[PDB]
Structure 1
Amino acid sequence: GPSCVMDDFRDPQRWKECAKQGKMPCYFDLIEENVYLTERKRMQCECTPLSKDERAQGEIACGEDCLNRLLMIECSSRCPNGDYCSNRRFQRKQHADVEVILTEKKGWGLRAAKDLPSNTFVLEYCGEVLDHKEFKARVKEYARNKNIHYYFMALKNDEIIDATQKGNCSRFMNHSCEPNCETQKWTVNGQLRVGFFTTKLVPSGSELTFDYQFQRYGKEAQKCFCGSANCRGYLGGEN
């Protein structure tokens, strides 16, 4: 099919022109962090600073043993490893090399541009953060408009991320009943964010997918075309 790279979305003019020719997805507002529709001392880890030779050797500053990494909290600028800290991936946009592609029936999708090792950070899922009332309001709005794609993601109690109008290329990852990625909820400056992380080695060219768990709403449920042997048949939660 037709494909495009993440830089292609930085030009709002070349994009809208590309969209008309079915060589890029529909236009949306690109944002680099969540936008809270309604608005609702710090502790650094105890990792030992890495030596000049240790970093050169290929040692990880704030690796698997980091106090913050083990609670899925990112370190701040005030980390003892400073610049070298590998636990600031959201804040530094340390995203994987991914392309936006057209699938057969699922609309647009994400694929690995290179081989992606297991538990690699893909993309932060950014959008407008809604409460339970605002979310339910917009499902009815989107249903009335007769939208085909829905871009809701559960963040926490009374916080749902909506990437329908505003977000980034994370909003193109499709559901699979047998996924190669998962969601991980991460704390940055006392605030919870959600990103996609590989659960296995994704070969270059392979579509990136996660298991979208979300409580179903309404009578009609979207059919699943993920093509897996164990396909649940529909997107979301049991009922």
Structure 2
Amino acid sequence: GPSCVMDDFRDPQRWKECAKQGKMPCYFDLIEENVYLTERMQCECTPLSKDERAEIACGEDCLNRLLMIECSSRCPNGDYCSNRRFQRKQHADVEVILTEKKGWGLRAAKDLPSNTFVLEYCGEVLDHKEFKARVKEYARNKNIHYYFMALKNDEIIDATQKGNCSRFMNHSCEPNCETQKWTVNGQLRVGFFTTKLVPSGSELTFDYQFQRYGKEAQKCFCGSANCRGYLGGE
């Protein structure tokens, strides 16, 4: 299948013409951060010494990391903090590919260890009313793909028009990634993390959970032994 790299999405001109030759996915508005449609301290880690750096600054036992909170610039490890990954776009090396049946997908360019941050899932943040409106909007238009992720009560990310390359991650009944919900400046975000070692060339997948709506659920083509046959939480 045609591949491309995250850098390819930076040139919209080169992208729009790549898309017409189907060597790239359909155009969408690229964003490095979530957009609210309707508008809405620190850890006690011990500052590591610099030859200790040759131990993890803000590791397993960090008060913020334990609450899935990122540190700010005011972290007692300042620059050396390993818990600012979302903020520093410390994304994994991932390519975008055409799958047999699922549309476009993500694959690992290098071997990703377990428990590795992949990408933030970015989009427009909708309330429940905005969501329900859009689902019928999209259904009405006979859209083939759906890009919704539950963030919390009355907050659902919609990657349909605006997002980044996280929106290409396909669902699998038997996945190699999970979502983790992380707090950054008192604002909740969501990102993909490997749950095991993902060999280079491998498609990244996660187990999409989401309350079902309507009658015709999308069929799963994951090919897993334990395939539930349908996408959604049901």
Deviation at 1:154, TM superposition (A): 0.1
Deviation at 1:128, TM superposition (A): 0.2
1:176-210 CA-partner distances (Å, limit 9, x unpaired): 00000000000000000000000000000000000
Deviation at 1:140, TM superposition (A): 0.5
Q: How many residues are treated as equivalent by the alignment?
A: 234
Q: Does 2:96 align with 1:95?
A: no
CA distance in 1, matches of 2:81, 2:194: 21
Please give the secondary structure, in 2, of the residue aligned with 1:54: coil
Deviation at 1:237, TM superposition (A): 1.4
1:198-236 CA-partner distances (Å, limit 9, x unpaired): 000000000000000001111100000000000000001
| Runs of 4+ with >3 A deviation | none
CA distance in 2, matches of 1:96, 1:148: 27
Please give the secondary structure, in 2, of the residue aligned with 1:53: coil
Please give the secondary structure, in 2, of the residue aligned with 1:52: coil
CA distance in 2, matches of 1:217, 1:34: 24
Compute the TM-score of the two structures, normalised by the length of structure 2: 0.99
1:134 corresponds, among 130, 134, 139, to 130
1:132-182 CA-partner distances (Å, limit 9, x unpaired): 000000001001111000000000000000000000000000000000000
CA distance in 1, matches of 2:26, 2:124: 18
1:67-87 CA-partner distances (Å, limit 9, x unpaired): 000000000000000000000
1:221 corresponds, among 209, 212, 217, to 217
Deviation at 1:60, TM superposition (A): 1.0
Indicate the residue corresponding to 1:193 in structure 2: 189
Question: For structure 1, which runs of at least 5 residues remain unmatched after alignment?
Answer: none
CA distance in 1, matches of 2:74, 2:198: 34
1:88-118 CA-partner distances (Å, limit 9, x unpaired): 0000000000000000000000000000000
Compute the TM-score of the two structures, normalised by the length of structure 1: 0.97
Question: For structure 2, which runs of at least 5 residues remain unmatched after alignment?
Answer: none
The Cα RMSD (Å) is 1.3
Please give the secondary structure, in 2, of the residue aligned with 1:68: helix
1:9-31 CA-partner distances (Å, limit 9, x unpaired): 00000000000001000000000
